[PDB]
Design a binder for this molecule. Structure first.
Ligand SMILES: O=P(O)(O)O[C@H]1[C@H](OP(=O)(O)O)[C@@H](OP(=O)(O)O)[C@H](OP(=O)(O)O)[C@@H](OP(=O)(O)O)[C@H]1OP(=O)(O)O
Ligand SMILES: Nc1ncnc2c1ncn2[C@@H]1O[C@H](COP(=O)(O)OP(=O)(O)NP(=O)(O)O)[C@@H](O)[C@H]1O
Ligand SMILES: [Mg+2]
Ligand SMILES: [Mg+2]
Ligand SMILES: [Mg+2]
Ligand SMILES: [Mg+2]
Length: 325
């Protein structure tokens, strides 16, 4: 009798190259069998018909029925790698920043503008040419405006008059671009937003990817904040720059992983003013195009499974040593 690790996510994720790379490696564990739940089953079958597993790796993305995943876990009580209830909170940037603050994690100064869709003018916003006031809090340009929905990637940056004004509108990458300049200088007038101070960086973002609290891979990418042209190598994959996290940042990774209860967790750092600020926590995310990450991630996940479940399966297990990479 094998320990069964169930993978429960949308097909776009379950059949992604990084997923296939990691699952083939987890399958190399002698006592582990991987079962990938079919999307048609996830969407159309009641949770009572879903396959059994002892350990569940499951995560929300666009179109995923999180309610069903939660009901399945309640029904079968598997060992859960990425907590499902926290994935509701991960979808809401206000909840994300609230958790970060509670954990003493540095983040941009921010304020929430909650807008009544039937009374859009009644909200706590005053606008000047070079600043906004949100619930009385002043944000001088440059500042950042994010939809409260973490799944809405239409994040806008507003430039000061001294820089020519206008705004940068970011979006999910469409081919060669991830943002574009707009002459519009005034903030959006419908929707709820987080406003935050613009953190000055060297023009890159640090993307961090945890596999449990003691392993995190980091890499840097050009920020879409000022120029929206995507940098590509001769093979057409986005250019990445090497990063090694300092001691403070490794602690940040440890805190984020545990606070959100997401063993596999992507989050973003802005290296600004000699500190590192978290500006986004995405939850489940694999590194792409690193063979070493595929090896390390599968080994760690397999080891977590074996550590937790070998005793009840009466399987001998000695806990091995793992890199922090
Ligand atoms: O949220 P991120 O960690 O920054 O990674 C995203 C995410 O992929 P993952 O779910 O596998 O982490 C996107 O998926 P969604 O959030 O949109 O569901 C995907 O966007 P696609 O929908 O277009 O697949 C996008 O990849 P893309 O480069 O094609 O925009 C990719 O970011 P990266 O691959 O650049 O790291
Ligand atoms: N406060 C800030 N100061 C400076 N740059 C910022 C700030 N907030 C976000 N940015 C830039 O805007 C980009 C997108 O913001 P982010 O909060 O990551 O949006 P998202 O829509 O969640 N992106 P994704 O990583 O795909 O989930 C970041 O990667 C930074 O380059
Ligand atoms: Mg096996
Ligand atoms: Mg996601
Ligand atoms: Mg981000
Ligand atoms: Mg995000």
């Amino acid at each position: 009798r094998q320990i069964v690790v169930g993978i429960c996510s949308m097909a776009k994720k379950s059949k992604s190259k990084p997923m296939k790379e990691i699952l083939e490696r987890i399958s190399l564990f002698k006592y582990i069998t991987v079962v990938v739940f079919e999307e048609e089953v996830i969407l159309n079958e009641p949770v009572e018909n879903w396959p059994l597993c002892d350990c569940l790796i499951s995560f929300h993305s666009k179109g995923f029925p999180l309610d069903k995943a939660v009901a399945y876990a309640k029904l079968r009580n598997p060992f859960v790698i990425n907590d499902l209830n926290m994935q509701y909170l991960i979808q809401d940037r206000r909840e994300v920043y609230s958790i970060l603050q509670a954990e003493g994690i540095l983040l941009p100064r921010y304020a929430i503008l909650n807008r009544d869709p039937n009374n859009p003018k009644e909200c706590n916003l005053i606008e000047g040419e070079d600043h906004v006031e949100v619930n009385g809090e002043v944000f001088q340009k440059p500042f950042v405006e994010k939809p409260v929905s973490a799944e809405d990637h239409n994040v806008y940056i507003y430039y000061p008059t001294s820089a020519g004004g206008g705004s940068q509108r970011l979006f999910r990458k469409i081919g060669s671009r991830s943002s574009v300049y707009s002459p519009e200088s005034n903030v959006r007038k419908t929707g709820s937003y987080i406003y935050e101070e613009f953190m000055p960086t060297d023009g890159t973002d640090v993307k961090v990817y945890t596999v449990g609290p003691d392993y995190a891979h980091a890499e840097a990418r050009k920020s879409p904040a000022l120029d929206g042209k995507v940098e590509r190598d001769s093979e057409g994959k986005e250019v990445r720059y090497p990063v090694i996290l300092n001691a403070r940042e490794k602690l940040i990774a440890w805190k984020v992983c545990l606070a959100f209860k997401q063993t596999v967790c992507g989050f973003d750092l802005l290296r600004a003013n000699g500190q590192s600020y978290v500006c986004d926590v995405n939850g489940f995310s694999f590194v792409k195009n690193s063979m070493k990450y595929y090896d390390d991630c599968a080994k760690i996940l397999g080891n977590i499974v074996m550590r937790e479940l070998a005793p009840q399966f009466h399987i001998p297990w000695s806990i091995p040593l793992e890199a922090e990479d």
